A paper describes a structure:
Here, we report the biochemical and structural characterization of two membrane-bound MBLs: CJO-1 and CIM-2, from Chryseobacterium joostei and Chryseobacterium indologenes, respectively. Both MBLs confer β-lactam resistance on producer bacterial strains and hydrolyze several antibiotics, although with impaired efficiency compared to NDM-1. The structures confirmed that both proteins adopt the characteristic αβ/βα sandwich fold of B1 subclass MBL enzymes (0.59 Å root mean square deviation [RMSD], over 220 Cα of CJO-1 with CIM-2), with two Zn(II) ions in their active sites (respectively). Specifically, a hindered access to the active site with the contribution of a Tyr residue in loop L10 and the presence of a positively charged Lys residue in loop L3 limit hydrolysis of cephalosporins with charged C3 substituents.
CIM-2, like the MBL CIM-1, was found in C. indologenes, an opportunistic pathogen of growing importance in the clinic which can express 19 variants of the soluble B1 MBL, IND-1, while CJO-1 was identified as a putative MBL sequence from the environmental organism C. joostei, first isolated in South Africa from dairy tanks. The sequences found for CJO-1 and CIM-2 were LLNC and ILSC, where the cysteine (C) residue is present at positions 16 and 20, respectively. Pairwise alignments reveal that CJO-1 and NDM-1 share a 25.1% sequence identity, while CIM-2 showed a 23.9% sequence identity with NDM-1 and 74.6% with CJO-1. Aiming to understand the substrate profile of these enzymes, we crystallized both CJO-1 and CIM-2 in their soluble forms and solved their X-ray structures using single wavelength anomalous dispersion (SAD) from data collected at the Zn edge. CIM-2 diffraction data extended to 1.56 Å resolution, and CJO-1 to 1.34 Å. CJO-1 and CIM-2 have the same conserved active site residues coordinating Zn1 (His116, His118 and His196) and Zn2 (Asp120, Cys221 and His263), and so have highly similar active site architectures, with similarity extending to the positioning of their active site water molecules. Loop L10 adopts similar conformations in CJO-1 and CIM-2, which are distinct from its conformation in the NDM-1 crystal structure, likely due to the presence of an extra amino acid in this loop in NDM-1, and further differences in amino acid sequence. Indeed, Asn233, present in NDM-1 and in most B1 MBLs, and previously proposed to interact with the carbonyl group of the β-lactam substrate, is substituted by a Tyr in CJO-1 and CIM-2, as observed in some other B1 MBLs such as BlaB and SPM-1 (34), and in all characterized B1 MBLs from Chryseobacterium spp.. Reflecting this flexibility, overall conformations of L3 differ between NDM-1 and CJO-1/CIM-2, and between CJO-1 and CIM-2, despite their high sequence identity in this region. However, Met61 and Trp87, which are part of a hydrophobic patch in NDM-1 and have been observed to be important for binding some inhibitors, are not conserved in CJO-1 (Thr61 and Thr87) or CIM-2 (Thr61 and Val 87).
Residue numbers in the entry: 28 to 251
Write the structure that this text describes.
């Protein structure tokens, strides 16, 4: 499947990557890395949708929600911020304003509270299986890396791994390490690689998606 841009408002870009899945990209202004693109994932089936990661703020989250409802004609069954930083969770309040349930790893909820961020509603201690139509997606904690709380999402039918910020794009630098566990990062991603051996598409938290090579690249980037 050839990636196709299907929406571009400059603040929000949506790229179709399978018959049923889309990457949403929003932008966070930074001091150390300029204007940073930030990825999430939308899966649709039977006029229902799952969303991994909020766009970076409420405004673009409202924009994404309006597009899923109004153009994909789909209700959003759940949103999963894959870690507590704003480029996965910064627009969580917009989702709660639409009464969309949020699911997150226990540590994401702990760190949201510690930082006085919007708090995901439904705690999972290891993994949770979420449904859109007949499709099942797994959100799962494999270990620490980019943060102590980072989780991935996996769509088994389409073999799509949303790696979140635990996964780097090919040739990426190490990025922001303030909250990272660099002693665990490679081991964590090695466990991801072994659990999803049929993976066809890997989406990083920032930059260009790819295939299984992004796991290998990330594993080696952080080998100590
Ligand atoms: Cl980063
Ligand atoms: Zn982050
Ligand atoms: Zn990130």
């Amino acid at each position: 499947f050839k990636a196709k841009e299907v929406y571009n408002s400059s603040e929000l870009i949506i790229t179709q990557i399978s018959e049923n899945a889309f990457v949403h990209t929003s932008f966070k202004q930074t001091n150390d890395f300029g204007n940073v693109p930030c990825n999430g994932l939308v899966v649709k089936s039977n006029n229902e949708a799952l969303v991994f990661d909020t766009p970076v703020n409420d405004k673009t989250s409202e924009e994404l929600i309006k597009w899923i409802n109004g153009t994909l004609h789909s209700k959003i069954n759940a949103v999963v911020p894959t870690h507590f930083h704003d480029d996965s969770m910064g627009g969580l309040q917009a989702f709660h304003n639409h009464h969309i349930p949020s699911y997150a790893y226990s540590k994401t909820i702990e760190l949201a509270k510690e930082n006085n961020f919007t708090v995901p509603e439904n705690n999972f201690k290891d993994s949770v299986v979420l449904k859109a139509g007949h499709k099942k997606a797994i959100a799962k904690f494999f270990g620490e890396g980019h943060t102590k709380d980072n989780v991935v999402g996996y769509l088994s039918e389409e073999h799509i791994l949303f790696g979140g910020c635990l996964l780097k794009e090919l040739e990426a630098g190490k990025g922001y390490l303030g909250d990272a566990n660099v002693s665990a990062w490679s081991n964590t991603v090695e466990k991801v690689k072994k659990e999803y051996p049929d993976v066809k598409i890997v989406i990083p938290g920032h930059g260009e998606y790819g295939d299984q090579k992004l796991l290998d690249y990330t594993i080696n980037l952080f080998k100590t």
